Design a protein around this ligand. Sequence first.
Ligand code: GTP
Ligand code: MG
Lengths: 81, 216, 114, 817, 72, 74
Amino acid sequence: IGVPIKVLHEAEGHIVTCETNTGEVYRGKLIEAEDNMNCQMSNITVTYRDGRVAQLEQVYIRGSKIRFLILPDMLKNMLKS
Amino acid sequence: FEPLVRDWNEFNDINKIIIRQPIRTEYKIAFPYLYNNLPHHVHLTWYHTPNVVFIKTEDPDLPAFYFDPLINPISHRHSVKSQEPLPDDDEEFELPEFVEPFLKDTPLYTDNTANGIALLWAPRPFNLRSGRTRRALDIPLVKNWYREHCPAGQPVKVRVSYQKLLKYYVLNALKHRPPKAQKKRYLFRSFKATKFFQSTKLDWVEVGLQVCRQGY
Amino acid sequence: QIGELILKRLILNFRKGYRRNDKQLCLTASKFVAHLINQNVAHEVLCLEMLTLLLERPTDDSVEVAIGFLKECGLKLTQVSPRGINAIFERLRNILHESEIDKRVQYMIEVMFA
Amino acid sequence: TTVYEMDFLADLMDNSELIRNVTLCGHLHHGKTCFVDCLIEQTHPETEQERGVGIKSTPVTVVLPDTKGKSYLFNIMDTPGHVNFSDEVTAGLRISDGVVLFIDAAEGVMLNTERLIKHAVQERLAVTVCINKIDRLILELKLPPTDAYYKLRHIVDEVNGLISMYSTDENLILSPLLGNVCFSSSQYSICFTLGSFAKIYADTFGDINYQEFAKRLWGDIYFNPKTRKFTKKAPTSSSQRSFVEFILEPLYKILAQVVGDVDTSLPRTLDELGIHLTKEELKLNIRPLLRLVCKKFFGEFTGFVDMCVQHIPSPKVGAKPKIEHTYTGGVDSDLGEAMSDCDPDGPLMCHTTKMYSTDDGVQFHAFGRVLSGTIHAGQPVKVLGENYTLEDEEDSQICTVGRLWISVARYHIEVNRVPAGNWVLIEGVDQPIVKTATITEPRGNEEAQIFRPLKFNTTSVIKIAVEPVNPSELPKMLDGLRKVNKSYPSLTTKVEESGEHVILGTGELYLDCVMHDLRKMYSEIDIKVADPVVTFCETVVETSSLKCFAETPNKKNKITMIAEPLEKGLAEDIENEVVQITWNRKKLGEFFQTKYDWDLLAARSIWAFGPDATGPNILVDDTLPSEVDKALLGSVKDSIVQGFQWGTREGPLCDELIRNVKFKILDAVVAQEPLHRGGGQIIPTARRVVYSAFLMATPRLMEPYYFVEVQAPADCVSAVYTVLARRRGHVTQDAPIPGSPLYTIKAFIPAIDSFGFETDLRTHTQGQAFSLSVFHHWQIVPGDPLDKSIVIRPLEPQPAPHLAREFMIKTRRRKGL
Amino acid sequence: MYNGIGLPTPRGSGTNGYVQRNLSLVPDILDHERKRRVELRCLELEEMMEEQGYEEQQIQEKVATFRLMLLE
Amino acid sequence: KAHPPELKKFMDKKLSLKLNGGRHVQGILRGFDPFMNLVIDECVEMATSGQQNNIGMVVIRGNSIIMLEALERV
Ligand SMILES: Nc1nc2c(ncn2[C@@H]2O[C@H](COP(=O)(O)OP(=O)(O)OP(=O)(O)O)[C@@H](O)[C@H]2O)c(=O)[nH]1
Ligand SMILES: [Mg+2]
């Protein structure tokens, strides 16, 4: 199991930002993060490629189709590696 | 021991007590503060250390782990006991034919485990595996003997001896001073380093006779 | 030979009472067989077979039959071959703590342990 | 005489959905403090000790990773387990949300364990179990692995039966499949749930699904190798259950290899597990070696944190089913819901339950939970004391905050701010408060209530008089007493009108520690102390065959009332809050008639309950033709009940409480216009009616009893028998312990004769036996309290016919005159 | 058990300080209760009448007779 | 490993599915496997025109699943 993955699981319960492979940007609370990067989130704000926003209560995004995630800086303080 | 240092009160008004059981010194030492006026320089002792239940075996024949007649039969009984959140089969489940009981090539016991467990609750030197070596005078062989509680029918002679050995023991423990200081002259290394002392190996008895002749 | 014929007859009576669900006859024949095992005329393997056939599918009746047998022949089996005592206790604990047994078999097991 | 990590701690506090508040409870010596110690060393590689018994609790809050790595903040209230100190447990039980009950594998359930499951279910907490001290089945008791299974199953089923006994709703049955129980060995670094063990199985071996696996291990599932498919009963192989073959037998072999064959087979077996160990670390002795191997294989602590996280309320979910009980209104308009939000915002309603004195000075640190809002340094706040009702605000002293601390066992890490949902040690709120406090916002007032002060499971019944040696220092001693009344939850101190200071406590060891702190720390005066005696009660045995009726000073109102005895069931219901008259008379009536064939007219007649809200006596009103004088009786009921409760409290015989009695009004000649003459001078009239009936036609005395549970070897049973005979015992039960070489004895003993019974027992048997004691019930003392033909030889012990006589003559001599 | 018997130190006392235990040691009550008897005589009559009718007149009739016929 | 997606929470709920190709459908989750292939019942194609057409019960390959959004509360 990968070092970044452990740090992701650490962000469960925190507000995170996710960009997909298609560039839609989802911000909200990370409920569950699976080993393969599958992500369950809640109370989302989504910002599309045209700039428009929307609001969603509940989402789940497949790990493969995630480009990246932004996590809190609360985590930064795994320095062993 | 000799006493440490050397009118009217109301609580001992003999009309105002109820005496059902006489207070006695063993209570007065179990609970120093509740049962005692002026408790000073008193150490508060209490212990209910979980009674250890180790069953000495008779022979090396029977297996190590073995229900002993001495143990009380479980025979746990209750109502129609219960039923589980038991995920019944006939749906599916299967173990990939790699995994196994974590180590089944190993037997439960050997001709060394019953012994090895008996060694686990044994007096201080023997429950070990390794330590430093002590001097020969530093090893009291008989202390564990006089530290015992009810000699139960020995002449008053030996009971008084028991109590006086306990007294000496306690005074030792009580008056213990840390080393607090150190200068470490080495008499014999200082001697050997001079041009006047030589060294050898002798029979004990020989240097015994030498020391006595030289004393004379 | 005479006591042997008596043993064969008590074996017939015990297997009859048991196989035909006759509580009284099975109980009496088990009484004679336990008295034999204590008088040292009936072997330990046959008493083992009796206790095992009674505790094969223990109900109130068959477990209680084993319990009555044991209340008298628990000394012979446990002093000649404690293996019988250990097997009896373990099998009792399993069949009376892991199957749908009631206060009847519960208290029979309790009497056994007593 | 944690730089980049405390910030992380703060953000965890701020999440309020990554924290869990749990109380670590159980019986005596069953593993709590060692659990906590090995745990803080897992996180930090960075009186009591001589006692070997913990007396007062300690809180720890630490950050633990689970079986997925997500860190949590854990609030762990390590309690003492001596049945005499149950007070401390109650404290934790309020300010926490779940309970981890530690049970011993070798003993099972005993006194304090069952009593704590009772106290935990009646306060509606979460209940988890750790069956600890499992090596005592392998190394010590030497049990075939299947009988280890049998014993574990037995313990779980019995705790299940009891938790069902005290709680109606079959919402939860405990079994490790649900994630309710860890298996542990605090000192040998092993704690595991079926979840954690199956995940270990998966991670080291192939990719098997650990969840579905864990669903299959405990509880009579067998497994056939060929099919590789677990089954209910159908091996005739005479094989073991899934549990044995897959979890126990491997654990037996681990231990047996470590302690038996450390020299030969251990390197091989260690290879087969994946642990590598240095030459230097295989030169350890067997206990350190065993623990090191078990730590290296079993990982740190995942079983516990997993079980708890999975079944903790998480104060955010948390609060709502709690403020039913804690809060005096619960949820009405403003604060019930506000707290239920658990938002770090606004209201700032906190509950402070402890005060840990600083070694140096007199001051304390109040310790409490912040339900709503967020506390900061210097924050001006207003306390709400225990007597404060909304229309008596003098009780609220107004103050501020000096420092803020957060706790590991004995390390104080000072912070600036704390949000709702945590515990905190607040400096500055010491001087205003006593046992309980409710903190609210200073100068920002909306309006505030208090949570009902702590309720305790046991009644404090032992009595000790205190005086200084020279009265010159009576004030200093008084300082001292205040302080200890501060630090001990159920220590009740009162200065009795005969001029003394009586201290009222739980047991002999309790009072010993009280006086230890009294003489050691809080005041250095030399103090005399009387011998222990107990507090009594008054009751009757038959009805007042004739009545004395009291009439006003200004002879206006005539009050006729008699007395008679209740039955025990309904009086205990009065105590249990089962017949709470907070109902309407309708519910009262159905209750009474339905259950004990009480009269519906008896129900219409029942007015109130006496000594206080909870008083085992009853006041009844039965005179129909004057009954319709509701103009006058409906007027006078207030003074009537006041005089009733006064009379019940202040005692007729020896100034002590009465119980188990029913009084009846049979003629109320009320003054027409019962103005202020009546209203003022009728309360003593009422209580003299009470005394009149009571003393008139059957005084009797009542004294408490103690429940004693004695562990003992098989032989020394007779020994304890004899002891209990000397002290008026009545041993009830004596029973094997299943799977142990010990017998358990359960017996009663008059709390009078309970003094030194423990040490007497242990001395006579060379420490082998050991008893704990609890108050259980009162009872009739066999004497006639009121007989002048009974004279008392003033120092030898009385025989039974006169115990009550003596008992009064002594106590009044010091109090009643 | 040094139970408040003996010497602090048997030291300069001329004795060994050995202690032992002394082996040779051994009238409205009836009228108020009639109104109580009368009490349920109105309610329980009006109740048993309520069981067969709560018209408050048929029960007042059964209660009025039970009050007059009993007091007679 | 060979893990399941954690979707039991979403079982028998109405969902909005964003697929690759800018494709979007809506339907009730009836099941799944470790590859995140889905069974969706009462499925409706939301054509880029805005028009919606009922396609019934269908299989969506997890490969081409970008994102799902619940139209219910879980
Ligand atoms: N054999 C064995 N003993 C253990 C184990 N874990 C803890 N102990 C016991 O733990 C004791 C240490 O104090 P604790 O019993 O933990 O303290 P406690 O349980 O809170 O009891 P109190 O402090 O009086 O409430 C030692 O006496 C050991 O007997 C264990 O895993 N195996
Ligand atoms: Mg402790």
